[PDB]
Structure formats: structure tokens, C-alpha cells
Paper text:
TPH1 and TPH2, together with phenylalanine hydroxylase (PAH) and tyrosine hydroxylase (TH), form the family of pterin-dependent aromatic amino acid hydroxylases (AAAHs) that catalyze the hydroxylation of their respective aromatic amino acid substrates in a conserved mechanism, with molecular oxygen, tetrahydrobiopterin (BH4), and Fe2+ as cofactors. The members of AAAHs are all similarly composed of three domains in structures: an N-terminal regulatory domain for robustly modulating its activity, a catalytic domain for substrate binding, and a C-terminal domain for maintaining the oligomerization states. TPH2 is dominantly expressed in the central nervous system, where TPH1 is not expressed.
There are 17 helices (labeled as H1–H17) and 4 β sheets in the TPH2 monomer, together with Fe2+ and imidazole as cofactors. The TPH2 monomer contains the catalytic domain and oligomeric domain but lacks the N-terminal regulatory domain, although full-length TPH2 was used for sample preparation. Thus, it is most likely that its N-terminal regulatory domain is too flexible to align the signal during 3D construction and thus is not seen in the final map. For the A/B interface, the C-terminal helix 17 of each chain forms a leucine zipper–like motif to maintain their interaction. The interface area expands to be approximately 1,838 Å2, and there are 27 amino acids participating in the interaction, located at not only helix 17 but also helix 11/15/16, as well as the antiparalleled β3/β4 sheets and some nearby loops. Besides, we also identified three hydrogen bonds mediated by E464, E468, and C478 in the A/B interface and a stable salt bridge between K157 and E269 in the A/C interface, which certainly contribute to the oligomeric assembly. Furthermore, we performed interaction analysis of the Fe2+ cofactor with the active site of the TPH2 cryo-EM structure. Figure 3D shows that catalytic iron binds to conserved H318, H323, and E363, which form a 2-His-1-carboxylate facial triad, in a similar manner to that observed in other AAAHs enzymes. Therefore, both the crystal structure and the cryo-EM structure might represent the activated state of TPH2, because their N-terminal is not bound closely to the catalytic domain whether it resulted from truncation or flexibility.
Author numbering:
A (entry chain C), B (entry chain B), C (entry chain D), D (entry chain A): 151 to 490
Write the structure that this text describes.
């Protein structure tokens, strides 16, 4: 089977297997014919190729124009969250405004964001010179790690970006990784894809595209948005909720066959009910991917284990019994401190 | 109830509540009438009062005499472990010789030891200016943290020590924290004592004294030693394995009432069978300690949670079901990829 | 809430709350203008109104014409099972031919059938003077009891029946209650409907109509039939597997709104995958029926218990722990008798 | 391995493998030189050799002298229960007085007793021509079946009995089988001994002798009696709570090596805390009996299953999951119909 990391320190081979670099601006890229930008965006590549597990992420000092771009996006995008975004996004945004520094005059740093996430759900972030393969991104979601970029848009226009700058992974992805259920959902998508055939990693990356990127949920009646591609794009957060687009339920058996459009809107946005419903649908879709073992994530050691014999399975069951014996005692305490 | 830390960040208020300091050494201390020694015991206190959660532990460079003392103790203890120590100590010592640097001509560092432990059982190490209360030392084992000292004996005689030093916590305690079962045992002793009355913290500290400090086990027809007080002391390791000491079974109801002797040999020694037997006996004894809630350790967030209502208990059960599903899938794979 | 039985002996109020009687042939009955027939349909009603929990079911001796009718139906319907019925029906029919007496010139008895079922899945059968309400028929599947009739068709026509008789509940229902997973499915449908509002018992009875009466399954490619309404009717079993019938998918949120046709074919024939996934769909749908408690079936006592406080839930968890210890020991034995 | 029954209907080979008969009065029998008595023991033997699984137990009509003897024992023994018996005996005796007929001038019948037990704990009773081997008596507790006698003492001095008449199994054994936890304890002792070597059946029968026959418990302070040998004997129920006998703690590793006296007060009466504590000690001791498989009792089918591969263990785990869903739903109901 193909190689996957078996401990969170071996994840540095994946984090550094970058296909294309974030300094390679394309032809249609505003700033492809610039001189000062390219140097700025080449600084970030070298700052990100110097990360190593265990060392705090260095702080980047954003200039005066970058800060204005961040503020423009923040201002123009936060005045339509209250009526378009889901509930678990609104219950988490103020905490980010309070502890990490989300304000029009400041650009959050990855150290504060990573220390804020690490205490709420367990996730952490690490910087990447952009565009690592989907196998190596899903293999990082298995350890509860998220690969971020640090650069910002071109001040040319602050509302168009053919790529994931750092304003897409702070306003789209982070406010919703601080939720335990979304964290469990993401990590399970990631664990399902460890050592799988290149033909199943594509189905999983497609399900992730249509769930954790362009997803919609209806939780009290009318539906809302919980995908990053929406929650970070003004032009597409409106279209998706205005009744001019197709919306059909989520089904991983047919949803894994779709065109992941990059520049234009989507033919159809898939809707779901709750992170638990989608988590169950995806855990059922999984186990339909051929693999000759099972994997178990150990969160004390932070390492993956291959259940393929009976000694391993016996360890897992023995550790389940000790967690059942805690419930069976919390309940006794409630009883005695009430009437039986 | 008494204050306890509810997240591994708040453990700095406990790690720094030191009763007496490692510089304020007793009068009976060889070196109480010295001038150069008493000035390095202050460098160590200063480096230990400067630790903060999240920063790698700085490295200490040991002089030529300190190194020779460490080597003397190492070479004098190494020729007893093969026939006196337990089985797990023996299976873990060579790995320490290979990865952390256990050998004459250098003293292991706490950074290498902490990174070696963190990958095997989950424990980590942090330096302390000595002698913090028992409540604050047990509240640190709840989070899987061990409080170590960094100084070394007085070169006068590398065989007598009335106190802990960096040779009692590298040769006595560490080689056996790298075992998952000893790690669960220690952490459960620690979790039982969170917010308990000062009269129960004493019973728990006594059980810990007679189990994890001066303990004996019989794995084959003959018994061995798995306590640090033994595995770090030549005079007492080859006295408890001899027909001149009393040895009765372990019973947390009658052993929590006994004298913890500090300078002389213990009368009784409380043999046991296995870390699992002692873990079960302690979990039975540990439901007597009066407390109006239960605690649940969350290892992703690394935080303690109070089970005292039904929403918390329902969360815990929902997380148990997902771990039962993993076993139920591992077994199906093990079947289909075999004969039913 | 509405009254439901809380022990298998109180089920005699439900078993004897018969709406219409099996002696009341309607105008359209091919025996409505007969004289000797009715004098037998009265004997059956009388023998079925005399059953009492604990007494073996008396044996009915079928005349020469009744036996010939049974044989006609048997041999005319068994020559198209091999290519139409599911696999769990074919793996159970020979056992019935061997132990209970399925063969022409002999009509099986309910005592032999009930003793054959009681050893394979736990079900038993008891006779009923026909047509008890749906609430009272579903409250009997909660205890793993099935209400059967004992009469037979009118010999005039041996292949048309506007009602259930002893040939519909022996060739349609019984060969598939002897399966543990179909037994669990049926009992869960029954337990979901204890003390529920008359408006939910109708949705549950509809799901049961379209799953356990007219159901289809595709388990190896092409689909097959596992409903009694099909497996007991030549005309309809040979039409739902053809290409002149609309086969939709199973979804308890919509299928619970359908016309339960009694004399003509069904417009739609809902299809599924396996008793396990249909059981999961029904268990998720079955938590959207308003009820202020939960019920737990105790199979030693054979009684229902209301989980509505913490002492009951604590009992249930305490039994789960003892059932998990058995697995944790079976695995250890497999290990030691292999290599670890 | 030795033959054991794998379904509750195969238990008729064990129930009828009687070593000596209840009509064979020995020389020391106060009725050894009688003529009318023996002709009654013959009747009881003949009626007990005619039982067959599935048929209600016939009723025995006791004469006037027999009834007066039963009344003497009842009256002389019930006036010292309130201060000597455990609490779970006192909370069950009145129910027996109410439903089964415990009172002078009436001797309870085994049909009423068996139908009263079957609804409280699951046990049932069946008559035996006395003295079947210990292997065959323990293989009957695995299925929750108890083998009783139906005869009564000789009216001459109705206070001495060198054997278990029907007054020892109604006043000693039955009032405490109607408790769910004592029923679980007994059945586990019985299941531990299925297909074991004749040298372990002796240790298990000894533990049963010193726990379920001559046992004592301390549950609120001073200790009480819960064994049948005590609760049915005036002379020995007094020489157990008055301090003239040696009371030692219960330990299945040493108590399984003691001598069971038949006509003389036991030199030592073992004491315990609760049926759960003794159940745990026995499940621990029951791991050191050599056997190459595990057994699982299925209570719907009422049959034993050999866990020796992975398909069986997978079935068991799959049922555990469904039993855990019920708890996870009961807790949600409590939350909802309360405050979160
Ligand atoms: Fe994104
Ligand atoms: Fe120590
Ligand atoms: Fe039917
Ligand atoms: Fe007895």
C-alpha cells in the first residue's frame, strides 16, 4: 500500500511535498506583471519552507496595504453573516474577535489561531507553500492538522481571488474548526483515506469538496451556509442562498462523481442536515473503499495504529471498558446526590 | 471544593507553588558548609523558575565532576537490574540507551527524555525547584506531566542521597513511564485526587508512596522491583529482594494508613501482581473518596470536564459508540480477508 | 399515554381485543352462500378464543379437502421460489420441510412451528380470531409474538384469497422469522410503537406494510422478494419481479404516506438492501415519534421497562459492562491459543 | 472436552442422570425402619422421574401430617429472620407470602413458585429424584434452572434433617433467587463450569458451597446471613452471628481448598460485602480454569454459544452497539424533557 505517516512527526514529509509553489503566479493572475509583489510573495515561500514540528510559528508583520485589504474583506463580508451563515459559525466568530484579534485594523496570526483552536477542538495549523496534493492534505486532517497559507490578495481588487489566500482560511475555515463535531467530521474524512488507492482518494476529496467547501445546511427551517468557499466569497454566498441555483440532498454514492469547478459557480450545491448526519453518511460510504486493515488514532501518543490482528483489537476493547466505567459512576453520583 | 486546574495551561499555577526550594538545602546536607556547590544549586533554581508552557526546555551543560558522579551511579546500578528489576524496566532501558543518551560521559537532557516519552505513553517532563506539595504533584499526573529536578548529588559520595536529584528521576522513574499501562495507572491515581479533601489526598499520596515508589511485583515464581526508591538506590534494592524484609500483599484499605519513612528502610513492602491488578484495586478504593462529581479527561483538548448532569454523560456515551464501531469494522475486515 | 402491556402475560388483553371475527364472512366471500363452510369457521373461532398463556396450543386435524387445498398451493407456489425468493428464505425452507412437516398430504401445526421458531430466533406464534387492530398487532411483536390464523381457503378457488389464512402465515411469514436479523428488525418496529399516539401507529403500520409485507431486496445484483404478500401469492410475486412495475427506494419519511391497497396490485414496490440497513433507517425515523420515555426489553423476565430516570439507565449500563467483558476474554483466549 | 448441554431442551439428560435416589433412605434415617413413609418416597421418586421440558409441573397434595410438619418449621423459623437474615431476603419474603402461599396449613407448590420466579429474575424450578452430580447441578444454573425436591421431613421431631427436603429449597433458596443480582451471580458460577475438567468443577462447587449455601454478609454494620444452609436451619443460623465461630473473609483462591462438612457446623464461615463484590471475585478466579473457548448465553433462544472465532465475536459486539443506542437515546429524552 502507498506510504502514509504513522506519527505526527513523520507528517513533515507530507507537509513539504509541495506540487506547485505559492510564488508561481499564473498568467491570468493580477500581479503577474508586477515587481514588488512577486518579491513579497516569494518571501512567504521561504518563511513556510522553514517550519519544523515543535517550533512555534514565527510571526509575520503585514504592511499597511495588506492590512487595508484584509480590513476591506472583513468589512464587506461580515455584514451578511448574521443572515446567511450557520449557527455554529455565529457562536464562534465573537470568540475569535475576542481572543485572536479579528478586527478591521489587525490581521490575525497563525500562532494565536493555532493556540485558540488547540484548546477548543484539538486542531492546529501549520503554514504551507501552496498546493500540496489531495492525498497529503487528507493525510494531515487525520492528525487534526490544517495546512494554511500566509500571503494575502493583491490590493488591486480586494474581492476577487483565484486561490486560497490567508483571508480564505481565517474567515472561511477557522471559525468552524473550533467546533468539536466539525472537528470529528473532518478527522474522519481524513482517516478514511490513509493508504487508499489513488482512485478512492479522488472520491474522498470530492466529498470533502462538496461538504466542507461548498456545503449548505437547513437546521431550523430555511437553510444556511457552512462551507468555506461560500463563507469567504461575497459573490457566491448570495447566489447559493438566493433561489436561482439547484440544491439536492447529500449522497456520497452519487456526490463522489461531480465536476469540481474552480472559476465559475457550481451546477448544484448539496444540502445536508447536521454534521452528525453527514458524518454517518460518510462513515457508511467509507468501508466501500478497499483496504486490507483498519486504522485507529491514539490521541495520547498522537499516532496511527493498524488493527489487523487480535492483540490490537483486544487493547482497544480493554480501553473502551475503562471509559464505560466512568459513565457508570457519574450516574451513581447523580443518583446518590438525588433520590434513587 | 479546592481549586484544581481545568486545562493544561492552568497547570503553571501549580508547578510554581513550591514549598521549599532546591537551593535552601538542609543543614545535615553534605555541602551545607560549602561555597561553590551552594552557588550552582541557585543556577538550577533560577532556570527552573523560568519555565513556561509551550517553550522547549533549555539545555543544561553538566561540568566534569557532575558527569563523573552520574557515571559512577550508572555503572554501579547497571549490574543489578538484570536480576533485580522487573520485566518492563528491562525492555525499556535499551531504548533509552539508544535514543536519549544513557551512558557515562554525558547526562541525559530533559528535552530528549520528554520527546522520547511523549511518543511512547504520552507523558512529558518539566523542571521544578524542588518539593511541591502532594496535592500539586498529583494534580500534574492527571494531565500526564511529571515534575523533575535537574541538579545532581554532591560529588562527595556518589552513593548517598537524602533527596531526589536528576539521577533518581532518570534511572528510577523514567524507564517505566514509557509503558502504556504504568502510564494509565499513574494518571488514574492522579485523576482520583482532583478537588478532594486534604484528608484523602494523604491516603492517595500514601498509596502512591507504597506502589510507585517502593513497590514489588512477582511475575514469575520470584518477585522483582518496580519502584523508583528501589531502582535508584543500591542499598535498598538488594535488601527488599532478600530474606530479611517483611512483604505483604497490597490492599489500599490498610496500606493508606502507614508511616512513610524518609531516611531508614521501610518495614513492609507490599508486593503486588500486575499494574492492572493494582489499577483495579485503586479504582475500587478510589470510589470511596467523597466528591460530588466525576471528572473526565479529554485528550484532544487536554482538559478536565465535570460530569454532573446528563448532557455531559450523553456526550461521553456518543463518543464511546464511535470507538465501538472501529472494533466492529476491524473484525469484519479480519473475517472477509480470511475465511468467515 | 395509551395502555400497553408491561409483561408477556398481560398480552392476553391485546390478543383477545378482536375487532371483527374470522367467522364473519363478507358478501363477496366465495363461501358467503355456503352452509358447511361456516360451521367450520365457527369451530376455528371457538378454538382460538380459548388460548391462554402457558398452555400448549391444541392440535387441529384438517379434513381431506383442506389438505388437498394446502397441497395445491404448496406445490404450485414452490416451483418458482428458487428464482424469486431471497436467500434467507431458501436457506430456511428445507429446515421447515425437515422438522415441521411442510409437504403435501400434511398441513403444519402451530405447536411444531412455534417450537421450531423458539429455538432459532425467539419468536412464537399464537392463534387469533382474525383482524385485531394494528396497535395490538404491533404490541405483540415487541415481545416476539406473532398472531396467526388457523383456517384455510375455500376449496372452490385454491389460488385467490381476499384475506390471510393459515397458508399465508406458514409460507409467507414463518420461513423468514426463523432468521435472527429479521427477528430483530420486526421486534424493533414493534417496540417503537408502545404507548404512541394513534397518528404514529399508522405511520409505523404503513412502514411495516411496505417492508415486511410487500418488500423487495437486491443483494447480489438483480433483486428478489422478501415480503409475505408476495411470497404467498402467485399473481403478485410474478409481477413485482417483472418489468411492468415501479420499483422505488425505501425512505421511511415518505413511504409512511401511501395507499395500502388491499385487493389490487401496489403502484410502487419499495426496495432496500439488507435487514440491517432497513433496520437503521427505521431506527433513525423511529426517534421522530413523540414519546416522553424510552423502553427497554428485558429478555430474561420478558418484560418492558421505562427508562425515565438515572437508576434504570445505570442498570442498563452495568449490564453492558458485563457483556463487554465476555468479548474481552474471548479475544484473549484466541490470542493465547495462537501466538500473541 | 466433557459433554455439556447446548440448549435448554438438552438439559433433560442432566436432569435425569441421578446418582442416588430419594427413595433410598440410609441406615441412619429416622424413617429407615418404617413402612408407610418409604411408600411415599417411592411415589415422589416416580412423579419426579416423569417430568419433561415444556409440560407444567403436576401438583402434589400434601397430607395432614406433612402439612403440620411444614407449619412447625415455618413457625419456628420465621420468628428469627427479622434480626438474622439479610435485607434482600426480608424484602422478598412478604411477596412470597402474598403470591405463592407461604403460610401454615398450606405447602407451596412448585408451579406457583416457578411462575413467581420466572417474572422477577428469570429462574425456574424443576423436580429431581435427589442427588445429581455437581457437574450436572451446575450445568443447570447456566440456563437459570434450579433442581428441587418435593418430599418433606419425617414428622418425628421436625427439626433435624440430614438432607435437602422441600422445606430447605422453599425457605432457604427461593426467597433469594427472586433477586436479579443473586440470579446473575448464580448463573455466572454455573456458566464458568461448562466443559471444564473434573478438577475445576470441584473448586467451583466448593466456592458455591461456601458462598450460596453457608454465606454471610455485612451490609450496614453487623453482618447477616444469606446462605440456604443457614436460612433453613435453626441450629446453625444461631451459631453464625453470635461470636462463637470463626468468620474469615472470602477469597476464591484459598476458599476453594477447604473441606465441606455435612453433619457438623463449619469450622469457618466466609464473609463478603455484596453479591457484586463476590461476583467480581469469582469472575477473576474463573479466569484460572483451563478451557480453550468462551461461552455466551443467548437469552432469546436460551442456548449456549462457543466464542472461538471472529464471526461470533463480531455478532456479540454488534448487539452491544444496539444496546448502547438505547442508553444514548434515554439520556437525550431526559435532557429534552428537562433543561439541557
Ligand atoms: Fe478552503
Ligand atoms: Fe520519585
Ligand atoms: Fe402476512
Ligand atoms: Fe441448598
Amino acid at each position: 500500500v502507498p506510504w502514509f505517516p504513522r506519527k505526527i512527526s513523520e507528517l513533515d514529509k507530507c507537509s513539504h511535498r509541495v506540487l506547485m509553489y505559492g510564488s508561481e503566479l499564473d498568467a491570468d493572475h493580477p500581479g503577474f506583471k508586477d515587481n514588488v509583489y512577486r518579491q513579497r510573495r516569494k518571501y512567504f515561500v521561504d518563511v513556510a519552507m522553514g517550519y519544523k514540528y515543535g517550533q512555534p510559528i514565527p510571526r509575520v508583520e503585514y504592511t499597511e496595504e495588506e492590512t487595508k485589504t484584509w480590513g476591506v474583506v472583513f468589512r464587506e463580508l461580515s455584514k451578511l453573516y448574521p443572515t446567511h451563515a450557520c449557527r455554529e459559525y455565529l457562536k464562534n466568530f465573537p470568540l475569535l474577535t475576542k481572543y485572536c484579534g479579528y478586527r478591521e485594523d489587525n490581521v490575525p496570526q497563525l500562532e494565536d489561531v493555532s493556540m485558540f483552536l488547540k484548546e477548543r477542538s484539538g486542531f492546529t495549523v501549520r503554514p504551507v507553500a501552496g498546493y500540496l496534493s489531495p492525498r497529503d492534505f487528507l493525510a494531515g486532517l487525520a492528525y487534526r492538522v490544517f495546512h494554511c497559507t500566509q500571503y494575502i490578495r493583491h490590493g488591486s481588487d480586494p474581492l476577487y481571488t483565484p486561490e486560497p489566500d490567508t483571508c480564505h482560511e481565517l474567515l472561511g475555515h477557522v471559525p468552524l474548526l473550533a467546533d468539536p463535531k466539525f472537528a470529528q467530521f473532518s478527522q474522519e474524512i481524513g482517516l478514511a483515506s490513509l493508504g487508499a488507492s489513488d482512485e478512492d482518494v479522488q472520491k474522498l476529496a470530492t466529498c470533502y469538496f462538496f461538504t466542507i467547501e461548498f456545503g449548505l445546511c437547513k437546521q431550523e427551517g430555511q437553510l444556511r451556509a457552512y462551507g468555506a468557499g461560500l463563507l469567504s466569497s461575497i459573490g457566491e454566498l448570495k447566489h447559493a442562498l438566493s433561489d436561482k441555483a439547484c440544491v439536492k440532498a447529500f449522497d456520497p454514492k452519487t456526490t463522489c462523481l461531480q465536476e469540481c469547478l474552480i472559476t465559475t459557480f457550481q451546477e448544484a450545491y448539496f444540502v445536508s442536515e447536521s454534521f452528525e448526519e453527514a458524518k454517518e453518511k460518510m462513515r457508511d460510504f467509507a468501508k466501500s473503499i478497499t483496504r486490507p486493515f483498519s486504522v485507529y488514532f491514539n490521541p495520547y501518543t498522537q499516532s496511527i495504529e493498524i488493527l489487523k490482528d487480535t492483540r490490537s483489537i483486544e487493547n482497544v476493547v480493554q480501553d473502551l471498558r475503562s471509559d464505560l466505567n466512568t459513565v457508570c459512576d457519574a450516574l451513581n453520583k447523580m443518583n446518590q446526590y438525588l433520590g434513587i
